[PDB]
Design a protein around this ligand. Structure first.
Ligand code: K9V
Length: 336
């Protein structure tokens, strides 16, 4: 089997939709090489899509896993509901639970992996559906505790806290949604998001201010995508109805809804506890989610394996072969 990364419209995989908890969910499906060991569900983040797992999908197939990688709510061929409650980590976990079981049966179990927002999702999914999740890993995103209260992020960063998250203020607002419409702007956006720079090294995106709209005109080719990959992100994001970024930016509009779900769990729900084998792959140059952010996380796991790869936030691609080996070796030991 060819184990190189997926190309746009790779024929080694299938592209399908299913109705999931009221929404059309599009996904990549890769069938295993050899008798199926497990089904693996892979969850991307922002501003990515299923194709962001392009290094992991053929690899996991070659290891004997069936691989389901959805375009998550708001992204590409998956529906983008208007109701923000559809975008909470709890509802999205329920989405993943139903999609998972639509392949493994209701009595089935999966391996579950996540990155960025997807990492946050899979920890919550492993918390809300421990019957389903046999093993869970996250790249870049560490566990965060059950929210015990709600504070607006404005007031949080105004006090000087969570400064590495202040970009999310712009994202939840109207500026990115209103400005990044159509393929021309989306192309610039993606050059910015995947590391392209301007004639004086101007960054198109920063964790402080978000998208630097004034830079997008001079933004050069991104180092972390090739030209056809870039076009593929543009084409697929274009599947959303204008404003195309509404769905993806909805992930930054649920702080209070998520806080309300989880304050309920902090009060009455079971403890945030993970009994199944778990893997956290840190990224050294991820300035949105620096490795130090995971300090103290191990106390919530019976069985947490830690790794760390030298890469930016985009570790699935930049360090794809290393990430692959880390997942493969951990899975080989987790499941035995
Ligand atoms: O939005 C995200 N990434 C956007 C792209 C970042 C980037 C950097 C450089 C170049 C391109 C892109 N990530 C989400 C991941 C899940 C969320 O986790 C919730 C959460 C907490 F509330 C508190 C503590 C930890 C914790 F995970 C937090 C932001």
């Amino acid at each position: 089997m060819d184990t190189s990364k997926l190309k746009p419209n790779d024929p080694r995989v299938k592209y399908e939709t299913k109705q999931i908890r009221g929404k059309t969910y599009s996904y990549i499906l890769g069938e295993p090489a050899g008798p199926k060991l497990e089904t693996v569900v892979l969850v991307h983040g922002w501003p990515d899509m299923a194709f962001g797992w392009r290094h992991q999908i053929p690899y996991l197939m070659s290891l004997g896993f069936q691989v389901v990688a959805p375009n998550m709510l708001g992204y590409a061929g998956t529906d983008a509901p208007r109701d923000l409650s559809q975008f909470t980590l709890k509802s999205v976990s329920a989405d993943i639970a139903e999609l998972a079981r639509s392949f493994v049966g209701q009595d089935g179990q999966i391996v579950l992996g996540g990155h960025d927002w997807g990492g946050a999702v899979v920890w919550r999914t492993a918390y809300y559906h421990p019957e389903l999740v046999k093993a869970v890993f996250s790249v870049c995103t560490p566990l965060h505790p059950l929210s015990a209260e709600y504070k607006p992020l404005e007031d949080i960063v105004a006090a000087g806290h969570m400064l590495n998250f202040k970009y999310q203020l712009q994202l939840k607002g109207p500026d990115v949604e209103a400005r990044i419409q159509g393929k021309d702007m989306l192309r610039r956006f993606f050059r910015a998001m995947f590391g392209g720079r301007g004639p004086n090294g101007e960054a198109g995106f920063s964790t402080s201010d978000g998208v630097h709209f004034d830079v997008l005109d001079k933004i050069g080719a991104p180092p972390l995508l090739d030209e056809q990959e870039l076009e593929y992100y543009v084409e697929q994001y274009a599947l959303q109805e204008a404003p195309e970024l509404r769905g993806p930016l909805n992930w930054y509009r649920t702080r209070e809804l998520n806080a309300k779900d989880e304050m309920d769990r902090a009060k009455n729900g079971p403890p945030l506890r993970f009994e199944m084998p778990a893997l956290f792959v840190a990224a050294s140059k991820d300035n949105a989610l620096p490795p130090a952010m995971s300090k103290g996380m191990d106390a919530f796991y019976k069985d947490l394996t830690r790794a760390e790869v030298d890469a930016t936030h985009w570790a699935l691609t930049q360090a794809g072969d290393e990430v692959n080996r880390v997942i493969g070796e951990w899975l080989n030991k987790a499941l035995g």
